Write a protein that binds this ligand. Structure first.
Ligand SMILES: Nc1ccn([C@@H]2O[C@H](COP(=O)(O)O)[C@@H](O)[C@H]2O)c(=O)n1
Ligand SMILES: Nc1ccn([C@@H]2O[C@H](COP(=O)(O)O)[C@@H](O)[C@H]2O)c(=O)n1
Lengths: 124, 124
């Protein structure tokens, strides 16, 4: 059971960060979206275009998947995305990320019916 | 089980024009620090001062807690804090917060041995 002291630190303490930072985004979002539990997910991309635009990639250019499956698609246009990479200093449970704002084409794996993105493969 | 489509949205989608904006700090932090599960916590303060300074409040100005308990203390000096309050548009499970950076005195409840902050009572 979480201690009251620890609960206060969780709910109320942010000693180590600036609320006006633009580069703390990955640290917060990787935490928010549950990719820092058990271990730090080493690499993750967030896409800032509309969900409709991202879903539409599944109808765009067929390309090779990094894993050799044949269900990957590349966006016809570059998209606004954020690249999150673990830092050299990052050590679970203190997961630290470098945030990079990028405009690149995304490659996603699509699946399901309707065919929708199910995995983020690469940005190129 | 979380659907593949949902997993992609959780891991990879953050649609919007200014995702890393300082205005989004409360949205990200409230999510990361687990105050948006079940319902949106309406009001929450994050403190940007050293934990040493916040612990030191437990030996500062005694004040009655808002709820009538008698283990509250007010900081002698103001502290840099961020006030998170639900917007008029916020509705679970889409919690939305206005982020406001202010410098105010904090009032905390102190408990345990050693006596440390266990509850955030108010900012004044
Ligand atoms: N550019 C990249 C590369 C990988 N990833 C994420 O990392 C996961 C595994 O990637 P790797 O197989 O390349 O290590 C992918 O499913 C994806 O969620 C990403 O989000 N952006
Ligand atoms: N200024 C404030 C007011 C309330 N709160 C949080 O909201 C809870 C309830 O506050 P109220 O008593 O004002 O409704 C407190 O336990 C505290 O966690 C806060 O963090 N900062």
């Amino acid at each position: 059971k979480e201690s009251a002291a620890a609960k206060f630190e969780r709910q109320h303490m942010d000693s180590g960060n600036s609320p006006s930072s633009s580069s703390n985004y990955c640290n917060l979002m990787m935490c928010c979206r549950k990719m820092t539990q058990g271990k730090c997910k080493p690499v993750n991309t967030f896409v800032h275009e509309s969900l409709a635009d991202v879903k539409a990639v599944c109808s765009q250019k067929k390309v090779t998947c990094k894993n050799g499956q044949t269900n990957c698609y590349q966006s016809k246009s570059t998209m606004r995305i954020t690249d999150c990479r673990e830092t050299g200093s990052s050590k679970y449970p203190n997961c630290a990320y470098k945030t990079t704002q990028v405009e690149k084409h995304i490659i996603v794996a699509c699946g399901g019916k309707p065919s929708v993105p199910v995995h983020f493969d690469a940005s190129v």
